[PDB]
Write a protein that binds this ligand. Structure first.
Ligand SMILES: Cc1cn([C@H]2C[C@H](OP(=O)(O)O)[C@@H](COP(=O)(O)O)O2)c(=O)[nH]c1=O
Ligand SMILES: [Ca+2]
Length: 129
């Protein structure tokens, strides 16, 4: 895989963000995770967590996997990096997302994220408390 530039347009929620990619506004859905909806328990915290990652970043990057790059809603499907830290993985590691939506062919970082989840669960963080 490889990283590509993007710039923040606006935070949305724990697992979606609006970025400018190749000069075009797009909504991105973070691969391999599920955050709670804003109206659900840990939703606000997940949204805040992701929001802070984007807004503090000097450099946002997107990384597509090997498969589908957009979903049926036209959302980009990527791993998102904030100053080199993967937001997807950070969310799971902190117990603010579950590993989810693991589809054949876009699953390059699956094991990395599962390892983070196992650690969040051990620590009983947030969703695992
Ligand atoms: C994360 C992800 C979601 N989706 C679709 C499946 C789900 O369809 P349904 O909307 O039919 O449930 C939806 C879940 O996203 P949200 O968790 O953002 O709602 O997005 C993909 O198709 N590919 C993916 O990689
Ligand atoms: Ca969600």
């Amino acid at each position: 895989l490889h990283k590509e530039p993007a710039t923040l347009i606006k935070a949305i929620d724990g697992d979606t963000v609006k970025l400018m990619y190749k000069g075009q506004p797009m909504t991105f859905r973070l691969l391999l995770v599920d955050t709670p909806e804003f109206n659900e328990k840990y939703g606000p915290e997940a949204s805040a967590f992701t929001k802070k990652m984007h807004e503090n970043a000097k450099k946002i990057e997107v990384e597509f996997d090997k498969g589908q790059r957009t979903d049926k809603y036209g959302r980009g499907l990527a791993y998102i990096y904030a100053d080199g830290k993967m937001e997807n993985e950070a969310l799971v590691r902190q117990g603010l997302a579950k590993v989810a939506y693991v589809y054949k062919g876009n699953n390059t970082h699956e094991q990395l994220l599962r390892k983070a989840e196992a650690q969040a669960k051990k620590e009983k963080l947030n969703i695992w408390s």
